[PDB]
Amino acid sequence: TENAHKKADIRRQDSRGNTVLHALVAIADNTRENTKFVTKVYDLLVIKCVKLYPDSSLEAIFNNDSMSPLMMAAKLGKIGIFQHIIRLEIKDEEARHLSRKFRDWAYGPVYSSLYDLSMLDTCGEEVSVLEILVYNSKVENRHEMLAVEPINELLRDKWQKFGAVSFYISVVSYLIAMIIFTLIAYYRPMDGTPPYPYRTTMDYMRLAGEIVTLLTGVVFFITNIKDLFMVNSLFIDGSFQLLYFIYSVLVIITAVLYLVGIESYLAVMVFALVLGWMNALYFTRGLKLTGTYSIMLQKILFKDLFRFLLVYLLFMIGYASALVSLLNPCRDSSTFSKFLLDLFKLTIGMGDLEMINSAKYPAVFIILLVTYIILTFVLLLNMLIALMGETVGQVSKESKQIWKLQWATTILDIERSFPVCMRKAFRSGEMVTVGKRRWCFRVDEVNWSHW
Amino acid sequence: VLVIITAVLYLVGIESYLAVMVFALVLGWMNALYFTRGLKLTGTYSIMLQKILFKDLFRFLLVYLLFMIGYASALVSLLNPCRDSSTFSKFLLDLFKLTIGMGDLEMINSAKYPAVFIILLVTYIILTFVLLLNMLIALMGETVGQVS
Amino acid sequence: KESKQIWKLQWATTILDIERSFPVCMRKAFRSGEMVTVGKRRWCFRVDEVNWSHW
> Which among A29, A33, A393 has CB closest to C53?
A33
Residue A202 CB: number of other CB atoms within 10 A?
8
Cβ(A180)–Cβ(A205) under 8 Å? no
Strands (E), B28-127: none
The reply to whether residue A267 touches residue B115, judged by beta carbons under 8 angstroms, is no
- Contact with chain B for residue A249, Cβ under 8 A: yes
B9, B11, B12, B14: CA torsion to nearest 10: 60
Q: Report the C-alpha gap between A31 and A35 in whole angstroms.
A: 6
Tell me how close the Cα of C32 comes to any Cα of chain A, in angstroms. 28
Cβ(B129)–Cβ(A355) under 8 Å? no
**Whole-angstrom distance between the N-terminal and C-terminal Cα of chain C?**
38
- Contact with chain A for residue B111, Cβ under 8 A: yes
- Contact with chain C for residue A191, Cβ under 8 A: no
Q: Report the C-alpha gap between A349 and A396 in whole angstroms.
A: 42
Q: Report the C-alpha gap between C44 and C41 in whole angstroms.
A: 9
Beta bridge pairs of residue A97: none
CA A94 to chain centre: 44
Going by DSSP bridges, is the β-strand pair A110-116/A101-103 parallel, antiparallel, or unpaired?
Answer: antiparallel
Q: Which of A427, A446, A439, A438 is nearest to A157 (CA)?
A: A427
A195 upstream amide cis, omega within 30 of 0: yes
Chains B and C touch each other (3 or more Cβ pairs < 8 A): no
Task: Return the half-sphere exposure (C-beta side, CA atoms, 13 A cut-off) of residue A444.
Answer: 5
Chain B residues with CB under 8 Å of A337 CB are: 115
- Contact with chain C for residue A33, Cβ under 8 A: yes
Q: Report the C-alpha gap between C21 and C11 in whole angstroms.
A: 16
Tell me how close the Cα of A46 comes to any Cα of chain C, in angstroms. 23
Q: Which chains touch C (3 or more CB pairs under 8 A)?
A: A
> Which among A278, A295, A349 has CB closest to B66?
A278
Mark residue A192 as left, alpha or beta (left: phi above 0; alpha: psi -120 to 50; beta: remaining): left
Tell me how close the Cα of C28 comes to any Cα of chain A, in angstroms. 37
Cβ(A157)–Cβ(A117) under 8 Å? no
- Contact with chain B for residue A231, Cβ under 8 A: no
Please report the resolution in angstroms.
6.5
Cβ(C53)–Cβ(A33) under 8 Å? yes
Instruction: Decide: helix, strand or coil at residue C54.
Output: coil
The reply to whether residue C50 touches residue A33, judged by beta carbons under 8 angstroms, is no
Collect contacts of B56-59 with beta carbons under 8 A, ≥24 apart.
B56/B134, B56/B135, B56/B138, B57/B135
Per residue, the 3-state secondary structure of chain A, as one string, reads: CCCCCCCCCCCCCCCCCCCHHHHHHHCCCCCCCHHHHHHHHHHHHHHHHHHHCCCCCHHHCCCCCCCCHHHHHHHCCCCHHHHHHHCCCCCCCCCCCCCCEEECCCCCCEEEEEEECCCCCCCCCCCCHHHHHHHHCCCCCHHHHCCCHHHHHHHHHHHHHHHHHHHHHHHHHHHHHHHHHHHHHCCCCCCCCCCCCCCCHHHHHHHHHHHHHHHHHHHHHHHHHHHHHCCCCCCCCCHHHHHHHHHHHHHHHHHHHHHHCCCCHHHHHHHHHHHHHHHHHHCCCCCCCCCCCHHHHHHHHHHHHHHHHHHHHHHHHHHHHHHHHHCCCCCCCCHHHHHHHHHHHHHHCCCCCCCCCCCCCHHHHHHHHHHHHHHHHHHHHHHHHHHHCCCCCCHHHHCCCHHHHHHHHHHHHHHHHCCHHHHCCCCCCEEECCCCCEEEEEEEEECCCCC
CA distances B57 to A132, A421, B68, C9, Å, are 44, 48, 16, 44
The reply to whether residue A257 touches residue B121, judged by beta carbons under 8 angstroms, is no
Q: What is the DSSP letter of C36?
A: E
Q: Report the C-alpha gap between A209 and B56 in whole angstroms.
A: 35
Q: Which of A237, A344, A383, A392 to mutate to test the interface with B (most CBs of B within 10 A)?
A: A344
Q: Is the four-CA dihedral A28, A33, A35, A37 of positive or negative sign?
A: negative
Residue A308 CB: number of other CB atoms within 10 A?
17
Beta bridge pairs of residue C44: C34
CA distances C6 to A69, C9, C14, Å, are 43, 4, 12
Range C13-52 burial, b when 16+ CB lie within 10 A, else e: eeeeeeeeeeeeeeeeeeeeeeeeeeeeeeeeeeeeeeee
- Contact with chain B for residue A414, Cβ under 8 A: no
B19, B21, B26, B27: CA torsion to nearest 10: 120
Q: Which of A243, A244, A266 is nearest to A253 (CA)?
A: A266
Q: Which of C52, C53, C54 to mutate to test the interface with A (most CBs of A within 10 A)?
A: C52
Rg (CA), chain B: 21
Rg (CA), chain C: 17
- Contact with chain B for residue A272, Cβ under 8 A: no
Q: Report the C-alpha gap between C20 and A41 in whole angstroms.
A: 54
Q: Which of A377, A395, A113, C31 is nearest to B145 (CA)?
A: A395
Chain A residues with CB under 8 Å of C50 CB are: 29
CA A236 to chain centre: 13
Cβ(B16)–Cβ(B8) under 8 Å? no
Q: What is the DSSP letter of C34?
A: E
Q: Which of A345, A44, A205, A89 is nearest to B118 (CA)?
A: A345
Q: Which of A233, A242, A311 to mutate to test the interface with B (most CBs of B within 10 A)?
A: A242
CA distances A99 to A227, A248, B85, Å, are 43, 54, 79
Cβ(C43)–Cβ(C35) under 8 Å? yes
CA A131 to chain centre: 14
Identify the H or E element spanning C35. strand C34-36
How long, in residues, is chain C? 55
Q: Which of A74, A84, A85, A77 is nearest to A36 (CA)?
A: A84
> Which among A305, A344, A349 has CB closest to B101?
A349
Instruction: Decide: helix, strand or coil at residue B53.
Output: helix
Q: Report the C-alpha gap between A325 and A340 in whole angstroms.
A: 14
Angle between helices B2-12 and B17-30 (to 10 degrees): 160
Q: Report the C-alpha gap between A36 and A40 in whole angstroms.
A: 7
For residue B120, the chain A residue with the least C-alpha distance is A268
Cβ(B68)–Cβ(B74) under 8 Å? no
CA A311 to chain centre: 27
Cβ(B8)–Cβ(B22) under 8 Å? no
Rg (CA), chain A: 31
For residue C3, the chain A residue with the least C-alpha distance is A393
Cβ(A209)–Cβ(A184) under 8 Å? yes
Q: Report the C-alpha gap between A163 and A175 in whole angstroms.
A: 19
Chains A and C touch each other (3 or more Cβ pairs < 8 A): yes
The reply to whether residue A268 touches residue B116, judged by beta carbons under 8 angstroms, is yes
Tell me how close the Cα of A214 comes to any Cα of chain B, in angstroms. 19
For residue A308, the chain B residue with the least C-alpha distance is B126
Chain C residues with CB under 8 Å of A29 CB are: 50, 52
For residue B66, the chain A residue with the least C-alpha distance is A278
What was the experiment behind these coordinates? X-ray
Amino acid at A262: I
Q: Report the C-alpha gap between A31 and A36 in whole angstroms.
A: 9
Q: Is the four-CA dihedral A128, A134, A136, A137 of positive or negative sign?
A: positive
Q: What is the DSSP letter of B142?
A: T
